[PDB]
Design a protein around this nucleic acid. Structure first.
Lengths: 79, 103, 96, 94, 94, 103, 79, 96
DNA sequence: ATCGAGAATCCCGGTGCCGAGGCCGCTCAATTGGTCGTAGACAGCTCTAGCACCGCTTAAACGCACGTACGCGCTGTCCCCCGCGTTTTAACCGCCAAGGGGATTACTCCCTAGTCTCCAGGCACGTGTCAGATATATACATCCGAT
DNA sequence: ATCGGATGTATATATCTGACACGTGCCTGGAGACTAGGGAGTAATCCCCTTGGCGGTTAAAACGCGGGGGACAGCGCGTACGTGCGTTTAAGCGGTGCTAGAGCTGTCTACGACCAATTGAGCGGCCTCGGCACCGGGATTCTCGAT
């Protein structure tokens, strides 16, 4: 379903922020395959905090706690 | 008579001296250690916020929006090594086009 | 008529998307992605709406942090076009 | 109620010593909140691991000083070591 | 004298359950010493940081169990969770 | 009557239950927690040393020298992710020549 | 002095372990310039432990403590 | 006479140095390197001789861990020869 | 490829709205002053063990000829992706409920902390001899240049 | 392709010898009780806030087409680097030597924990006014076919 929610131009305008000039016609599928790996190494480690404290609601602190563990610390939400 | 203004800082010292006691970093902390740590926290926050205003001044604004911390952190060699891993929420990125992509 | 050359609009949407701050992927077709991934590890979750705009600030900080180190694997091969040889080289040098 | 714990109104009173004609936005009060909680919970978790290596249960100032020469890279370690040392010698004499 | 603290003669009595006709060398008794001290001082320093996030001062077994689903990647988390649970249910009944 | 053999492990439980008390991980630890942790430490050390013998068997030795732990750790997908950062003293490396370098 | 102690063939036989086939004639100086950066980010963080405990002798534990801090944990000496 | 071809002895000293375990740089012209670096941060040190064979097991575990991710930046450019374009690409993608 | 053409972009200056600055009021947490135990400062004296040093030696760095194979440079070749339009889809903004679950207080009693006291498991210091690396001739595996 | 004389690596064979494993003995760290308090479970409840649905409104994705500039493969060739022999080098190793400092113990005293009362600094809620976003027309910046 929703892996094709992140469309072609929204992957395109991400890469223009990175400073690329001409994207090939194959990155638009490869990026979808390397983003859904990244969300399954965060949400899998963000449910586990939410499941721990007996809550059914993944709050914003637990995500920052998940991203902190694998070296991608995120500011601007709590710590 | 407070404890910070005995040493003349701005970060609190009573608020730190419970967090080296109720985080279990160790059991006993010295009396000078929550003073010495409120200085090094000050000297870094007085280092970014010096550099934060210069991006606010060069871009002609008044408040420091989160974009201005991104230029302040990532345009200093001495402080980007301290924060080479972290990101910033809605920080943007530097203007950096490569050399060969120019016309 | 009027029509630019290929190599012009790219150099005026790098210099525009390296100055703005806002989101680049959408909001609601990303919120539908996070829930569909999370209907596997524990069914029937309920996200705080400051935690679906927390992932969206992290994955954009992960892909932008990937293309900037992917494009150095394209210019190194004397070409200006990324390609899935370049993504897969960017992740086998950095920790996969 | 939720009583709080933040470093909001302290960082705002360091901004008013370096640019006393500017101000700070809302989300930068959230970034700078989470920035000093990083530097606090990285240094204090280092002198903890340093006092453990020598079988000693006191975090003095001498273990914080060694745990600032290992986290600040260069040209901040040559200052912030000689910044707290001024701030401790203005403390025992009062 | 130097009295000691090692996990030498325990790991040697796990080698004698899986290959009881082999032996271990000297430096592998030093590697496996420093291997289990890694896994100990990575898991115990995670449930510590997990009990701190919920304002709670007890490391029970329920915080160690959540701190094994975050350090063991896959196909070890599906075993070592259901390995200690056997080892605790053989403990309260004795 | 020991405490490990109440639960049937091999790693000690009395020796761990001072190290969750005198390392200051937290102040209070449960009674089941140094049991549950001596199992997960066992199951990993009984996982490498199962794989350590197979490299010792395939290469026809008896003792496990430090070379044999390198093949045992780095030839399993489930356990190399656990140790993707660490190295091993005089461990050597895998036999891995690239494809294009062949004659 | 001693940066030319690590000679040409000892840099060569390191790279043969890495699986390279033909080393150029310029890596033999570049490797010396990227190794002496690495030892100045270890010995600088290994004297600091030795200076801390009032010892004039950099023991083996302090080096492992230095390499542990920057994500290059070393086994086989203590921990 | 007899003489191999270029491309042969390389493929019999990769397969020999990926099976042995011992040191590759020397002992005493590396011990003289560590002391000369350490006569700057604190003068007149005295190393334990299990700590000069601890650095020597770490830097060899750092350069071997560098060429294996350098050579992927050479084969990617359709060539079989590393060069200081490749080292400098290996350290600007990984943390410098 | 220099001048012109035009599409886009950098400041002008008015508008206006809503989030930072700012006291005001309540109240939990810091500061003040004794008491206690006790960790760490200091000293002393053994003693491992790291640094200098020789001296015979032998693998290994160092230099030099050299043929070949890849580096890098060029040229055409061709399609795959940029760009501008015209359309369709739907994100977003706002509206508008109904209740799930977060947050907190409220009583309580099980669980670990701490003190106590004996032991038995774990380590130190011996030591016997077992896997291993040794060598050495021989054989099996793989090329390199003529056929 | 296929055969040939190396050329090397791999398979099997006595002989040490220095290295793990195990016996022998202790002693200090865990174990078993016994108690007191204080956390965490459990019960129970207001309301914040997410979930959901819908209408309308339009910015944006989608698909389609012309062409142009680059990716990709090939000829070529010039130098860069490997292979090898021989030639100086200094790593290594055993071996004896010198004392410097790690490593460990007792002997006092200062240092933070703990409690306990006392009060301000810190925050919650609260309007409100300067700073930021526009909103249209001037002024420039800058790529792109041409006489």
């Amino acid at each position: 379903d929703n892996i094709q929610g992140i469309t072609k131009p929204a992957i395109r305008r991400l890469a223009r922020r990175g400073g690329v000039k001409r994207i090939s016609g194959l990155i638009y599928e490869e990026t979808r395959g390397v983003l859904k790996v990244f969300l399954e190494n965060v949400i899998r480690d963000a449910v586990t905090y939410t499941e721990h404290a007996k809550r059914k609601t993944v709050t914003a602190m637990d995500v920052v706690y998940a991203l902190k563990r694998q070296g991608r610390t995120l500011y601007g939400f709590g710590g | 008579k407070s404890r910070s203004n005995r040493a003349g800082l701005q970060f609190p010292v009573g608020r730190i001296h419970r967090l080296l006691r109720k985080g279990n970093y160790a059991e006993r902390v010295g009396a000078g250690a929550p003073v010495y740590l409120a200085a090094v926290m000050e000297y870094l926050a007085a280092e970014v916020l010096e550099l934060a205003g210069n991006a606010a001044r060069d871009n002609k604004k008044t408040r420091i929006i989160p974009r201005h911390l991104q230029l302040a952190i990532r345009n200093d060699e001495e402080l980007n090594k301290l924060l080479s891993g972290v990101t910033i929420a809605q920080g943007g990125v530097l203007p950096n086009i490569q050399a060969v992509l120019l016309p | 008529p009027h029509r630019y050359r290929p190599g012009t609009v790219a150099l005026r949407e790098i210099r525009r998307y390296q100055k703005s701050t806002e989101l680049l992927i959408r909001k609601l077709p990303f919120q539908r992605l996070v829930r569909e991934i999370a209907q596997d590890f524990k069914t029937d979750l309920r996200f705080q709406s400051s935690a679906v705009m927390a992932l969206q600030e992290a994955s954009e900080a992960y892909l932008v942090g990937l293309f900037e180190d992917t494009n150095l694997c394209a210019i190194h091969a004397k070409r200006v076009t990324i390609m899935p040889k370049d993504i897969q080289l960017a992740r086998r040098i950095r920790g996969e | 109620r939720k009583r709080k714990e933040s470093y909001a109104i302290y960082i705002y009173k360091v901004l008013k010593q370096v640019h006393p004609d500017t101000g700070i936005s809302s989300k930068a009060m959230s970034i700078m909140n989470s920035f000093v909680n990083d530097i606090f919970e990285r240094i204090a978790a280092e002198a903890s691991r340093l006092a453990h290596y020598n079988k000693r249960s006191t975090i003095t100032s001498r273990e914080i000083q060694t745990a600032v020469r290992l986290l600040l890279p260069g040209e901040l370690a040559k200052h912030a070591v000689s910044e707290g040392t001024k701030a401790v010698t203005k403390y025992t004499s009062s």
